[PDB]
């Protein structure tokens, strides 16, 4: 490469290094916050899971995939998308909801027909119950009547690890009166409906809080790796820069000396 090409490239990658370093620190302070907020949210969300995990419940299927809109977080989106298509091929009428635009990006070419609705603006402000509520309301009052459903998301484990999991949504208000839920029998349909709705919000809230912690930690790591790779390139380019710099002085000077000797 030319001296000008090297110089321009060096300046670009130095800029990339600075930004990825800054965004690593942003993700680190955001991750710390998510992991604090996850603590009570895990108690809450697991408490909402207690009903189904103390009773054998069986049975149009609804897949809700949860990630975000934001790139540079490793295999966060591919993971969830991989289990979305995997469970979709195993099921028998399937409709898909994606929360986080990156879900729709990966699945659209093959599963465009099966998409009910998409949600965006995920991964900018830490999710709230309001956000769970907004998704919840745009599913009940939308038009689709699902018999069963499942929500797919990244469950946080540590700074560097997460597991793609699936939770069931038996929210079909018809299935709440079956074999094992026979002991829960004095409730009128009005209150069961209110319960069913609230628990639908709880499980989506739970997925939102787990996903975000996993996404922020994975963002931290990706940016950390990006800036380490950039620094290595910078080191190598700087060496080429200095070699080339010296060689241009040398070359120029030999030309002028030849020009002088020839007179």
């Amino acid at each position: 490469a030319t001296l000008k090409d090297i110089t321009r490239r060096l300046k670009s990658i130095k800029n990339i290094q600075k930004i990825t370093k800054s965004m690593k620190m942003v993700a680190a302070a955001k991750y710390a916050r998510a992991e604090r907020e996850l603590k009570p949210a895990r108690v809450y969300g697991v408490g909402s899971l207690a009903l189904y995990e103390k009773a054998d419940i069986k049975t149009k299927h609804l897949i809700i995939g949860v990630s975000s809109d934001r790139g540079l977080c490793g295999a966060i989106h591919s993971s969830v998308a991989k289990q979305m298509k995997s469970e979709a091929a195993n099921l028998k009428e399937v409709k898909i909801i994606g929360v986080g635009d990156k879900i729709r990006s990966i699945l659209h070419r093959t599963h465009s027909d099966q998409f009910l609705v998409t949600f965006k603006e995920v991964g900018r402000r830490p999710p709230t119950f309001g956000d769970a509520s907004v998704i919840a309301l745009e599913l009940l009052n939308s038009g689709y009547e699902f018999d069963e459903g499942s929500i797919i998301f990244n469950r946080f484990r540590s700074v560097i690890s997460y597991k793609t999991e699936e939770k069931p949504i038996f929210s079909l208000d018809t299935i709440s009166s079956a074999e094992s839920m026979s002991i829960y029998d004095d409730i009128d349909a009005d209150v069961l409906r209110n319960y069913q709705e609230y628990s639908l919000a709880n499980i989506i809230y739970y997925s939102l809080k787990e996903s975000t912690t996993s996404e922020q930690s994975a963002r931290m790591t990706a940016m950390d790796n990006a800036s380490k790779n950039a620094s290595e390139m910078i080191d190598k380019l700087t060496l080429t820069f200095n070699r080339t710099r010296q060689a241009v002085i040398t070359k120029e000077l030999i030309e002028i000396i030849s020009g002088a000797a020839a007179l």
């Binding site: 490469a1 030319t2 000008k4 030309e255 030849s258 020009g259 020839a262 007179l263």
Partner: protein, 128 residues
């Protein structure tokens, strides 16, 4: 001879990089001092005077024409190089070819974005 006798000719100079090298050898051995990259001081002129001879003639001179397609070899894509820059600055336009494009399957390996030609007479065609 075609240009001036009412006819049309196309000339290809393949290539002007090698002509400049030969000019450099000859000039150095004549003991004319070496200039930029050891080329003679007037390497620009070597090419500018040649290419200026391609022309379109008016009717009082016969209506003939001579079109030139000079060819320049770059090194590792360096169009900013001395001889390449001279000839770019002389010509009416240029067709830029690139190795990346060639191997990607773009053949002819023309970089459409960078390649330029001067307007075009209204007449290139009409359905074209």
């Amino acid at each position: 001879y075609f240009r001036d006798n009412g006819k049309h000719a196309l000339i290809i100079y393949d290539d002007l990089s090698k002509q400049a090298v030969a000019y450099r050898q000859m000039s150095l051995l004549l003991r004319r001092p070496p200039g930029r990259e050891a080329y003679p001081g007037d390497v620009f002129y070597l090419h500018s005077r040649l290419l200026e001879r391609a022309a379109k003639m008016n009717d009082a001179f016969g209506g003939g024409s001579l079109t030139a397609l000079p060819v320049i070899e770059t090194q590792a894509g360096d169009v900013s190089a001395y001889i390449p820059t001279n000839v770019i600055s002389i010509t009416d336009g240029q067709i830029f070819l690139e190795t990346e494009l060639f191997y990607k399957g773009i053949r002819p390996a023309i970089n459409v974005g960078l390649s330029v030609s001067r307007v075009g007479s209204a007449a290139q065609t009409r359905a074209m």
